[PDB]
Each structure stands twice: as structure tokens, then as C-alpha cells.
Write an enzyme that holds these catalytic residues in place. Structure first.
Site, PDB file in Angstrom:
ATOM      1  N   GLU A  59       0.822  -1.202   0.000  1.00 40.20           N
ATOM      2  CA  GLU A  59       0.000   0.000   0.000  1.00 40.20           C
ATOM      3  C   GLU A  59       0.859   1.256   0.000  1.00 40.20           C
ATOM      4  O   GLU A  59       0.495   2.269  -0.617  1.00 40.20           O
ATOM      5  CB  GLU A  59      -0.938  -0.022   1.203  1.00 40.20           C
ATOM      6  CG  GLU A  59      -1.879  -1.211   1.198  1.00 40.20           C
ATOM      7  CD  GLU A  59      -2.874  -1.165   0.050  1.00 40.20           C
ATOM      8  OE1 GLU A  59      -3.520  -0.113  -0.145  1.00 40.20           O
ATOM      9  OE2 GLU A  59      -2.996  -2.180  -0.670  1.00 40.20           O
ATOM     10  N   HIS A  97       1.927   1.850  -3.577  1.00 36.49           N
ATOM     11  CA  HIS A  97       0.821   2.496  -4.283  1.00 36.49           C
ATOM     12  C   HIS A  97       0.799   3.993  -3.986  1.00 36.49           C
ATOM     13  O   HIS A  97       0.809   4.829  -4.902  1.00 36.49           O
ATOM     14  CB  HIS A  97      -0.517   1.866  -3.886  1.00 36.49           C
ATOM     15  CG  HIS A  97      -0.827   0.587  -4.596  1.00 36.49           C
ATOM     16  ND1 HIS A  97      -0.388   0.316  -5.873  1.00 36.49           N
ATOM     17  CD2 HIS A  97      -1.537  -0.497  -4.203  1.00 36.49           C
ATOM     18  CE1 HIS A  97      -0.814  -0.881  -6.236  1.00 36.49           C
ATOM     19  NE2 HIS A  97      -1.513  -1.397  -5.241  1.00 36.49           N
TER      20      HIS A  97
HETATM   21 ZN   LIG Z   1      -2.525  -3.173  -5.003  1.00 39.14          ZN
END
Ligand SMILES: [Zn+2]
Ligand SMILES: Nc1ncnc2c1ncn2[C@@H]1O[C@H](COP(=O)(O)OP(=O)(O)O)[C@@H](O)[C@H]1O
Ligand SMILES: Nc1ncnc2c1ncn2[C@@H]1O[C@H](COP(=O)(O)OP(=O)(O)O)[C@@H](O)[C@H]1O
Ligand SMILES: Nc1ncnc2c1ncn2[C@@H]1O[C@H](COP(=O)(O)OP(=O)(O)O)[C@@H](O)[C@H]1O
Ligand SMILES: Nc1ncnc2c1ncn2[C@@H]1O[C@H](COP(=O)(O)OP(=O)(O)O)[C@@H](O)[C@H]1O
Ligand SMILES: [Zn+2]
Ligand SMILES: [Zn+2]
Ligand SMILES: [Zn+2]
Lengths: 418, 438, 438, 418
Positions: free
Chosen positions: B267, B270
Site C-alpha cells: 500500500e 501504491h
Molecule cells: Zn494493489
């Protein structure tokens, strides 16, 4: 529960087109000949609203039904439902049968029987009975062509997203019931909601009224309007950024320029930053149709470079390629391949070498026309900038305005304006 | 006249913990229920139906009851599973009777738990039709609100979500460590525990738990105390926690600490890609809690080649972070979804949008109209070129910022959730300024 | 006893114009209706049902009424669309009642318009079965004839065409310039127009019009005169013609002059190939009017390689003429159909009939039983060889005879239809003798 | 409405074959065993007529039904219809169930259930019940083989197009009701209608009677007969040209010659210019079957050259190729490929190289046998010309006549005459 043209705004051309249908419904025998009418467009542009308005203008009942109610039924139901629908409509005539989501039944197994029943009923009722069938759909690209044969929905109408003028008129219509403040400028709202639909504007005014009530006020003020718009944008409605507006303007301007330069006989329509939406042709006409289809993307590349081309060309590009394929595999318009025709999924198993030849030839055609379009756009880049300026301002201009802008640069264009 | 009579609720926002955002979202509904005429004073139409979806035990029914109690309005509850035995048969009521009983007690709330029982894709069909008819027809202006709840939103009949009937959905996520702490506090009020326990430790020790699980833990501890002396101690809590967590780890998915680290790195990658990209959207909060459920190019109308390249970059960010932190042997199956989308996107760029120079401006609507092998080879080569180019770019970006990302990952494994602004701050503490996309 | 009673008709061949061939074809039916016993004197069974098919407004119902009037027999009319409301329900008649009412009024004609309404591929099924039962069972010997009419023959239930029931079909084509002229004359009788108009100009100016369209034009002109002075003038005709033609050009297909030229060249190339080939069938008339509708190796039992090569040649003739006259940029999509057939035929010659030396006498019934790519490549190469060979041959033939073909095309654009004999004459006027295949 | 063998003409062999069935129907228990009988042939050759004649010879009722009535019915109808048909037939026994268009139900989804019901009924009724089921079809090549299993239509009969003798006898049958003139020569009509069916001849005489009546006469004269034939030919019936007759004669003669020369055990049938229509074999028997199948085309090429070969070989050729494929892909009779077996659409995904090997080997086999057949035809070209002369004259000759013609040239052929 009563609806008329007063509740519809921003589609004067469609109202003109359906004036004949309204005259027919007011007195069918006197008039006599449209049977069916298809309305297609994105969700929330007013298709069902337009049908209800037509029904109310003639003072006739309005029978509303959805394809979804016909599609899922047990085996043998849907056809008897279509037949009974037409019988009940015949008894209450003059009236309108409105079929929303007509795509649910009319795609290109059991649904086939219901579709055939629909066709039978469309053909069977004479014009004497006094019915009009109005269908509505978001997906006209997947419709069974039989639905458009003469006598069955032989008239199609596109309901486009509203431009700034349309958005302003819609905001007026929906403001009538609400008690707005004097300060609110609905024109500003219109210019602030490119890419909104009539439904989006209704929801905006409704959310603004909700926020006003929540703040205890008695009048809806620009504060609440802007708050509601910011609410929707920050996290239902999708707005077009000014950079997006410039891109779209260039794409549409390239489309129109190709239309106005090509040695063709098709008429060029109006230019607008709103997305757009059986004869004999020769090789040259088809090359020029391809050229027009590639014009928007060619303009995109000329102005913004290879990294600035956009998805807006998707439709256009596909059509172009499809056309090229027909030119090579169906119409024998390629010298290298010859006057051979295979495609009608083809019928006969084709060797890989021949498929490679077809693909290579399609690429040749498309790239040739794409270079042609890029060159044309380069040559006329400055008048195109002028058109784009006028376009970002007014959001829409006429083909005549396009030609005028261009002759302001000493350029005479073909009289293809529709 | 068989429908249950509506009754007020003894639950309010004091009993719900760890979802302040959902409370903000439903503030509008609570204000409407407190005074409908005020809302409609300016002809502003309010919402009719509201769908709450989330894993079981996250507080959907609790939230509905709390909304009912905040407005001091009746709460008429019915289960979708019960609908057939409720509104079908001789003597049985009708759905209309439910809605009219609500109208008479208006303003109030009709709560339909397990709405999926009736609205999946027979008699249940009849009941569903009755419900839909009432949702479209009934004049709710009196001030009643229908709240539906489901654990299985992926199998909902889309007809239930059409405008006017449950046209507003709300996700209730699992609580993060702070949320679990607040829930434990809420349920401690009735139990009067012993002094030695610090509930914050229990919270940190229960990743992936729902409010219901924390309820069950505290109640089991109180039961063990009673079976054991007027005071609930860390001993009993640890015993109950070990019991429930061991029993759950087998069947179900529990967050191991290694799993937590992997998720945090994914995450964080991202988010980093989101915050470094030149022309992207706004970055959302970073968290190892799942961020939604079912019911990647739709934020704009048109996108250009650069925007799509950057979307691909973001999609590959998690895997890039995984590789940078754990090496080529540490990349995980968690990237599966992401990877697919990225590749899918690349394909559209080449075969649908003509955004490849080598391929050209040819477009193949999709799936394929007898394409030669040479053309498929060109398309595949170009897709691989795009994906590997963006993946190397993302790996480089993560390498450049590995230390501030380690900081973010530490903060994330601690708090389980952080804001984009906290991300930017962690990065600023390393002399690195990131774009204000929060 | 609900069926309409039959009545004589005030229409005869004087009211029909531009289809002398159809009149010849129905002379047999008219003679039978005039005297059935004479026909059956030698046990000669006559036809029962007759299907008239053609675009709307070409005179199908008119032709049926004219046949009825020529024999001075009753005409019982019913619409297929009406059948359900006619012969289905309590109190409603039965189809048998229709046929028996005809038998009592025999000899007469039962006319069924829009027969497709009942006989496509429910209650309509019941009605169709009743009709079929009556067609097979009823002793028509009394001298009644059933004439069915349809605009959509491509969706007819083939059961309707089985022997004994509508086993005879007749196409009514659109009128050519002479036919349009004669129709305009016929409808002028009642209108008494002014002197200045020459209807031949109106005819030449209305390619693709039907008799109904010419009726509507003359009636609109008479209406405009009345609204305007006892006399119909060219002014009003031109106004009405502009109105109807503009309104029709949009929706529908109108014959542009360029389109007319392209069609003429295509059809002339077909005919030329037909008239030059060594061993072919007889050449039919040349015309730019469509020559049929739905409901290419069946003229003989067996064909040899030469006959098939020549059939391919003919099929490619239209495109060859298009290219010779307009160049490679002027070839059109009108050849589409033709081209397909040609290619299809070539494929059969190679993969089904073993008429390729390179491929050999191997036959693959069709579609394919896992064939190696090498074999498909050989088949495709041979098909391309055949098609291009015949196409070059056809182009050469057209080049050789370009001037007499220009003459034929001029005569065709003028008259819209010419005979094979006129073709031969045009060619003889250039010192070119063509084979007597007319 | 009564029909007997007097109304059927030109199929004495079929009448002999069905004499047993007629004896069975006259007294079933005494006879006892055929259950089902299939009639296949082109349309209008007298299949339904033959069934009705069988029914009338035994003085039993005749139950006529079509597959078309079973095929299109709603789900669950067709099976109950088949069952009720067999029950009603059982009640009226002894009788005949005639099923026209048996292909409509018996192809190789819902139709499957009806087909299974048919099979059940065929197997269930014992011979004691006293029923015979006669099916008729134009498309025997697409029939589900289960229909031919023992006990269910275990006897098949081909009804061929009539030769000149058959056409003459048919013209006699249909002339009986009509009052012809003395001058008419029906033998001339027969010799003038090669490739006609009994239905075509009926239609010819009927059209002639119609024209006679139209001319007011009282007797049908050669004028009207020739006029009707010219009418049909100029623009229902299809006649064989003399050139076509020569081509067909050579094809069939080559077929018979290969049959009579090959080192096989299959018996050669009669030679006629009318188109034609579970054991163990070894590689040699299969090579020779291929040879026979290629004989007609080989004769075509030898006599008329590569440009004179015809479509008449279509069937033959296909079978040959099919056989070759089985020899290579199913029976491992190729050395290059080996004793491998894949096909049963195959079951396992095969590599392209292996498919190329199979195709190359099939081509090898077929071309080898084709050269063999061409050489044989060349060697015996003159006796073949003699046979073709006799054939164009009489239209049909016996295998014995073929052998006789050949021994007239000092050639002794194998005693394979059936
Ligand atoms: Zn992902
Ligand atoms: N052109 C328009 N003018 C006025 N109102 C509109 C327009 N388009 C949409 N609306 C509003 O948006 C809502 C949706 O309209 P509807 O006709 O149901 O959409 P669609 O037919 O596309 O499904 C309606 O409540 C209507 O008032
Ligand atoms: N976020 C939360 N805050 C406080 N209590 C909670 C929360 N989530 C669940 N609970 C507790 O867990 C129990 C289950 O809640 P409920 O809403 O019935 O589950 P669901 O909504 O999944 O059906 C309730 O008694 C509730 O008090
Ligand atoms: N070939 C023709 N000759 C004379 N009049 C014609 C002809 N075709 C059409 N008409 C006129 O047009 C009208 C429509 O004819 P009708 O037979 O009803 O159309 P359809 O057969 O297509 O249903 C009639 O009034 C008829 O007089
Ligand atoms: N071999 C034949 N002998 C006598 N008449 C025949 C013969 N073949 C066909 N016919 C005539 O042709 C017509 C069609 O016969 P039918 O048996 O219905 O054809 P099929 O059975 O092939 O469909 C009948 O009227 C019949 O009199
Ligand atoms: Zn475009
Ligand atoms: Zn053509
Ligand atoms: Zn053969």
C-alpha cells in the site's frame, strides 16, 4: 404526474422531428407514417422524459414497460407478455408504448422468441390502430438490426448531452419549483458543469436545496449551489476539466476539418465539445471516410505530440480500422490481396499468410490516411486554433461558423455544411 | 397487520466507535429524520433508501439503530430471510403493510437486514417485486427512511440500486487499532473491568477483528471472571483472546505480522507512486484495512497517454515496493489483482486506443476478428515493453525513497492506518518534498 | 359467418401498367377463373395458391384485384394481420368459413394481404395451421384461387410454399421509366391535368419510384391545384415532386444519377461477360431495377471446370467494368455480393471438387477436419490464382469492348432497362458480333 | 384415396424387397422380422407414394406424420406426441406409421429428447402388436446412426430417379386418367426427360392437359406435351443435356471398370447414367475402395482433359479423402506416421507438424490411387467407349453387359457382378 415540452429543455431539433408524431397521435386517420421510434443516448439525458412529454403533448395515455421485465421470465412468458402488452395498448388507443432498455430483448436464446414476437406485433398493427412505440436504450451498438427495418422503429433519434445553453435551460426548468435567491447565476452554473446531463443538473439543484434547508435558510444561494457542486466533484456527476475541454475541442475541430476538406459528398455537422454519436461507396469515398475518422486523433497528435493523444479517439479509430478491413477482406479494394472476399467470424478457414497480408494492408491504409490527416492539420493549424478558441468559449459552433473562421484566413472550404 | 410494531432504540453514536467518517455521511439522514419539513421547505428531495455493506459484525445493524436513536424515531426491523414467511401466504401480511405501518409511525426507519436474501440475480421474487413497488410508489415525504444491510453485496440484484430505491450505499470497514480501542472502551462501560488491564494492548493485538469480536472477547472475559471474582483481569482477557484468536486463525483470514508488513509495503508503494506522479488524481489515505467490496478508467472522460502510463505506474507500485524491500524472492501473490489491471490497461493502449508507435493507430474493438500471429506478436511485445518500462521506473522511484518509505511502513504497522498528510510529513522529515495531492 | 362477403372489382388490366410479363404469367389464372370446367375437361389440375411479392406500393393488391375483374369473379379480401382478431375467439369465425364462403361464391378469389403476418419462422400459429389445413384439404375444383401478398418474403414459413399451397410465386418489380410513364398516364385519366405538362419528364425524373408514389404525386398536384383552378400545371407537379423526393431521399434509398451510372456499368459488365463466354447459359435482360428478392450452382446437374471458370468470370464482370470505367479508385461496394460468390465458388473448386492441379483430387466436405496450415496456404494461394486470373481476363474483355459498352450504358441510363437483343444490336453497330445467347 | 402398386412404377426391386413386409402386414403372427424401414432419395421420387402403396396392398390403415410437426413444439411436447402417436397406432393395428422428414428429429437439444422417445417406442413394441414404421428423408447423410440399430429401422431402401424405362412406365401410370391423343409417343417423352422424377413427369402431363384445355381441344397432342416440356425447360424440372449424359456415362463407366478390375471382394452393381446412392478391411481393400471411388473422375480426366472434369465426382472424391484420412489418423496404415491413432474433431490437441504429415500422407495415397485409375482407364479406353455408347443408348446396362462388351475386346474381367 403531467408532463409536456415545458418540462423538456435543450433539444429543439428533437422536438421539431417529433412534431410529426405528435400531430399523428392527435388525429391519426386525418394525418394519413411512422410506426416505431428509437431514442438512444447516455443515461440521464431525458429519453424517458422526452417520451412522456410526447405522450402529454397529444393528451394520450402513456404505457411504460422495460425490457428487464420481459427478459428474465420463465420459458414462454416473454412472448405472451409482449402480445398482451400490444393488445392492452390497442384497447386504450390512441396511446404510446414506451419500452425502456430495449437492448435487454433486442441483442444481436429464449430472448430470441420474445424479440420475434415484438417484431410480429410491430408489423401487425396497421396505422389505423393509432399506436406509436417508443424504445429507449443506452447501448445502440448491440441492437439486433431487425429492430430498425422499415415499419419497425424506422426512425432513430440521438439525445445528446447538453451544451452550456442546454444546461442553462435545464437549470431554469428545474429551478421553477425551488425558491432560489436573487444572487444565483444559473448561467455561471451552466458554464461550470460541462459534461453534466439533465439528471446531473437536477441532482445539483436538489442537493443545493437540501443544504440550504440544513442551514435553516429560506432561499437557495450561490453558497449552496457551489457547495453541492463541490460535493459531487470532490468524491454521481463527472465534469470536464478545461484541459480536457481543449483536447476535445481539437479532436472535434480536426474531425470537422477533414470533413470539410475531403473530396466526398457527406455533409459536415455542427462542431461541439460534447462527444458525438446501405448506400454504395467507391474506394475513394471510403478512404476519405477513414480520413475523417482519423482527423480528431491526428489533430491531437499535431497539437500535443505522441504523448498527448487521448482515448476520445477510441470510437473513431475502431470504425476506421473496421472500414479498412471491409475494404480489404470484403470489397477486394486492395491490389496486393486482390478481388477476393472471405468475411461475411468468417465462413472458410483462412491460412495465416493471408491473414498477415490483410493485416499488413489494413495497416498500410490506416497509416497512409493518418499521415494525410496529420499533414492537413499542420497546414491549417492557425485557423484551427481560432476555431478552438471560439469553441472553448461558446462550447459549440456551426459548420458555417467554422467555414467563416477559415475564410478569415483566406481559405475557401467545400460547401458541405448540412 | 402481522408486521412488527416499531419501537424506539436505546442506542446512539456513543455506542458506535471507529467510523467517524460514516457518522459524517449519515449526519444528513439524521438531520432529515429530526425534522423532515425543514428539509423539504425548499422542495429539496431527500434520500429514500440506504444500503450498508461490510463484513459480518462490523456494526451495520448497530449503525442503523444508532441513527434511529439519534433522531428519537421508531425503528422497524425485518430480516430479508424472514420476508417469505412474513409477506407470503394466506393470513400473512404484505410489504405494503410494513411501509404503511412505518408511515403511521413516521418519521421512522425501516431496517431490512440481509436484503440479499430477497434481491439476488419463485415466491422470493414476488416479495422482491412487492418491496420494489413500495420503494418506487410510497410517498416517503412523511419522513421515513429505509436502511438495508447485507454481507454479500456482490450478489445484489442491480434493480435494488436503481435511482429512488437504495440509490445510496455506505461501506462500514473493519476497525483499525484506534477503532478497536474505542470499541473495547465502549463495551467496557457495562463490564467494569479490573485496574491492571490496558485495553490499548488488546487492540494492538487484534488486527482484523470486528466490533463483534471485541464484544465477544470482553463478554467471555467477564464470564470467566464470574466463573472464577467481581474483577476482570489481564489474565482472563489473555486466555479468552488466545481462545478466540486460535479458533479463528484456522477458518478465516488473520493478519500475521509478516502479512501486515507485506500489506503495508504494498500500500505504501501504491501511495508513493500516487504522490510522485506528474499528472495524477488525489491520493487517498493509506491503510492495511481492506478499503471496499464489489457491487479501472472512469475518473475522467478522456485520458491521454501520459495519464494512462501514470495509472499503470501506480498499479505496479505495490509490487515494485515488494521487490525493493524483500527482493525478487519476496514478491507476493497480493499484487495479482493489481498486475492484471496494469497489463489489461497496457493492452487497451495498444489494441484499442492506438497509443503505440510500432503498432500504429489501428483499433480492434473488444475480442479479436481473426488477427494474424504477427500482429498478436507485435501487440504482446509492445505490452511487455510498456509494463517493464513502467515497472523499472517504479522500482527506481522506490529505491530513491527507500528510507522514508521504511518510516511510513513503521508508522503504518503501528497505527494500521495513516493519512496522506502524515505520509507527506514522514517524507518531509527526510528532506524530501512531495506534491500536495492529499 | 363473420368473414367479409365477396364483391366484384372495378379494376382490370387497364388500371395496371408496366408489368406486361406478369400479365402474361397470370393469363393462365384468368382463363381458369373465366371457365374452370374447360380447364379440368382433360383432368388438368390448376394452381391453387399464388404468392405476389415485391416492395410496398408496386401493385400487388392492385394486380390481384385486376385479375379478379378480368374474370368477372368475386374478390374476398382479408389481411394476415387481421387473421388473429378474425378467426380466433368465442364468436369469431374460422378460416374454413372463409374458404367455404368462397366456394359458395365460386369461381372467385381469396386475397390474403400481408400473409407474412401469420406465416413466419401462440394463437397466430393456430390460425396458420387452419389456413394450411384449408389449403391442403379444400376442394378448390369449383374454381376459386387464393392469392397471397407480402413485402417480406425472406421471413416466410417455407411450409407456406410446399406443393399444393402457394406453390407458385410471382415477383412484381419496380417500374422502369416506361412503366412509370404508363402508370402516370393511367392515374391521369381521373385527374384531367393541364396541357403544358409532359408526363414523360416526370417519369424520367423519378427513378426508383413505385406506382403508389406516382399516384401520390399526381393526387398531391390535383390537391394543390384545387387549393390554388380546374387545371393541373407543371408548376404544381414540380413542387409536389420536390416535396416527396426530398422527403424520401433521406429515409429510404433513392437513385442518384452517379449511382445510376455505377449500377449500369456493373450490370453491363455482367451481361457482356455472359455474352462473350464460350459455354454459358442464356443472358437475361439488362436493367438497373433490382431483379428479385429472397425467399450459385443449380442451373445444371454437373458442371465442368470450364463452366465454373466462366461463372466466376460473369460474377466478376460488374467489378471489372467498374474498374475499367472509373479506375481502381472507382470500384464500389456494390460488387460485394458478387465478389463473395466468386470467391466462394473458387473455394469449392479447390477444396470440394479437386479441380486444382497443385492441390490435387482431395476433397474436404463442408467445414474443416483439422487441416494443416500448409494445406490452407495452398488452398488460399490457388483460390487467389483462379480469382485474379479470371479478373484480369474480364478486365481485358471490357477494355476490348469499352466503346460499345459505353453505348449500352448510355441506352441503359436512358431507358433504365434494355433487352439482350438491344445489347447485341448496340454491339453490332460497332462491327462486333456477339453470340446469340439472348 | 386408395393407392396400390398399380400407381407405382419403375421400382420392381423395391417392390420385391417390400413383399416380405406386405406379407407380414397381411398376417403378422402367421409370418413370425422387420420392425422399421427407411426410404431415402431425392424429392419427388415416390417415397410417400411407395409407403401408401404398401399400406394399400395389405388393406391396412396408413398413419402419416411429419418430423416437422414434432420438431418445433414447446419443451416437453415432442416426446409426448411420439408416445401418443405410437399408442394410437397400436390401437388401430395392424397399420403403418409413416414419418416424413425423419431427418427433422433424427440429426446427429430438445429434439434429442423426442428422438430418444422415438427410439424407446421403436424398441418397445413387440412384433406381436402388428405395426410397421416407415420413415422418409432427402438427407440420409445427416441421420443419427442410432436410428439404424437392429430393431429400429434396420432395413434401408434407396428410391432412385427413374431411367428411361421407369419414366415411360410413370408416364403410362399418370396418362390413365387423362384423355391423350393417339399421336403422342410417351416413349419419346421418356427419352426426352433424363433426370426427371416421377413428380416431374406428373407435372409435365398435367401442364400439357392444362394447355390443351386452354386451346379448347378434347385430346392432348404431342404439341401440348412438347410445349409443356419446353415451358418447364425454358425457365421445376431439370433435364440432362446430351453432353452431360456423355460425361455421366464416362464417370459411371470408370467407376464400374475400377470395381471390376480391383483385387477386392465387393460386388459391382449395374451401370446407369442416373446418379448413384462395420466389417473388417485391410490396407489393400481400402486402397482399392479408394481406387474405385476415384475411377469416375479419372475417366473424366482421361477422356476430356483437366478442363473437363466435373462436379459429379464430388461425393466420390470426398469419400475417398475421408477414407484416406481414416487410414492414416485412425488405423495407423501409414509407415511415415506410424501406428498412432488420434481421431475418434479429435480428442487431444495435435501439433501442426503432425497434421502436416497426415495431410501430406493423405495426398500421397490419393494421388497414387488416382494415377493408378487414370492408367487403367487409358489401357481400356476403347472398350470403355463401347460401354459408353451402349449406355447413352439404353441409359442403363448390367454388370454382365459391361463384362460382355469387354470380352468382345479380348478382356476377361473378375466375376464381381452382383
Ligand atoms: Zn494493489
Ligand atoms: N434534457 C432534459 N431536460 C430536462 N430534464 C432532464 C433532461 N435530461 C434529464 N433530465 C432530468 O433527469 C432525470 C432523468 O431523466 P430520464 O429521461 O429518466 O433519463 P433517461 O431517459 O436518459 O434514462 C429526470 O428526472 C429529468 O427531469
Ligand atoms: N464499530 C462498532 N462500534 C461499537 N460496537 C460494535 C461495532 N461493530 C460491532 N459492534 C458490536 O458488535 C455487535 C454486532 O453488531 P451488528 O451491527 O449486529 O453486526 P452486523 O451489522 O455485522 O450484522 C453489536 O452488539 C455491536 O454492539
Ligand atoms: N404497376 C402499377 N400500375 C398502376 N397502378 C399502380 C401500380 N403500382 C401501384 N399502383 C397504385 O398504387 C396504389 C397501391 O397499390 P397496392 O397494390 O395497394 O400496393 P401493394 O400491392 O404494394 O400493397 C394503388 O392504388 C395502385 O393503383
Ligand atoms: N416412381 C413413381 N411412380 C409413380 N408416381 C410417382 C413416382 N415418383 C413420384 N411420383 C409422383 O410424384 C408425386 C410426388 O410423390 P411423393 O411420393 O410425394 O415424393 P416423395 O415421397 O419423394 O416426397 C406424386 O404425386 C406421385 O404420383
Ligand atoms: Zn471522433
Ligand atoms: Zn453483380
Ligand atoms: Zn461417382
Amino acid at each position: 404526474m403531467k408532463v409536456t415540452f415545458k418540462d423538456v429543455a435543450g433539444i429543439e431539433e428533437v422536438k421539431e422531428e417529433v412534431k410529426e408524431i405528435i400531430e399523428y397521435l392527435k388525429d391519426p386517420v386525418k394525418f394519413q407514417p411512422p410506426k416505431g421510434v428509437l431514442l438512444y443516448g447516455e443515461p440521464g439525458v431525458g429519453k424517458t422524459l422526452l417520451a412522456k412529454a410526447i405522450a402529454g403533448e397529444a393528451h394520450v395515455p402513456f404505457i411504460s414497460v422495460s425490457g428487464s421485465d420481459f427478459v428474465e421470465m420463465f420459458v414462454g412468458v416473454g412472448a405472451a407478455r409482449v402480445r398482451d402488452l400490444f393488445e392492452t395498448a390497442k384497447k386504450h388507443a390512441p396511446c404510446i408504448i414506451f419500452i425502456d432498455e430495449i437492448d435487454a430483448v433486442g441483442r444481436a436464446d429464449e430472448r430470441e422468441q420474445t424479440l420475434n414476437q415484438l417484431l410480429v406485433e410491430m408489423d401487425g398493427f396497421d396505422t389505423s390502430d393509432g399506436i406509436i412505440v417508443i424504445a429507449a436504450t443506452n447501448r445502440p451498438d448491440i441492437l439486433d438490426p431487425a429492430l430498425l427495418r422499415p415499419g419497425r422503429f424506422d426512425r432513430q433519434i440521438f439525445i445528446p448531452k447538453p451544451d452550456v445553453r442546454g444546461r442553462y435551460e435545464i437549470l431554469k426548468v428545474h429551478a421553477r419549483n425551488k425558491k432560489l435567491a436573487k444572487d444565483v447565476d444559473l448561467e455561471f452554473v451552466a458554464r461550470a458543469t460541462p459534461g453534466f446531463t439533465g439528471a446531473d443538473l437536477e441532482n445539483l439543484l436538489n442537493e443545493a436545496a437540501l443544504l440550504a434547508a440544513r442551514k435553516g435558510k429560506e432561499e437557495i444561494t450561490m453558497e449552496e449551489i457551489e457547495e453541492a457542486l463541490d460535493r459531487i466533484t470532490m468524491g454521481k456527476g463527472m465534469t470536464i476539466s478545461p484541459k480536457e475541454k481543449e483536447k476535445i475541442a481539437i479532436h472535434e475541430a480536426g474531425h470537422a476539418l477533414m470533413g470539410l476538406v475531403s473530396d466526398d459528398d457527406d455533409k459536415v455537422h455542427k462542431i461541439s465539445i460534447i462527444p458525438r454519436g446501405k448506400h454504395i461507396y467507391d474506394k475513394k469515398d471510403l478512404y476519405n471516410k477513414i480520413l475523417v475518422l482519423l482527423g480528431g486523433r491526428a489533430a491531437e497528435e499535431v497539437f500535443f505530440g505522441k504523448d498527448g493523444i487521448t482515448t476520445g479517439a477510441e470510437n473513431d479509430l475502431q470504425r476506421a480500422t473496421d472500414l479498412a478491413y471491409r475494404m480489404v477482406s470484403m470489397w477486394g479494394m486492395s491490389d496486393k490481396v486482390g478481388p477476393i472476399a472471405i468475411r461475411r467470424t468468417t465462413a472458410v478457414d483462412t491460412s495465416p499468410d493471408l491473414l498477415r497480408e490483410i493485416d499488413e494492408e489494413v495497416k498500410r491504409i490506416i497509416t497512409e490516411q493518418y499521415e494525410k490527416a496529420k499533414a492537413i492539420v499542420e497546414e491549417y493549424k492557425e485557423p484551427l486554433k481560432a476555431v478552438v478558441k471560439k469553441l472553448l468559449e461558446k462550447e459549440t459552433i456551426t459548420c458555417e461558423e467554422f467555414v467563416e473562421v477559415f475564410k478569415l484566413y483566406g481559405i475557401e472550404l467545400k460547401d458541405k455544411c448540412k
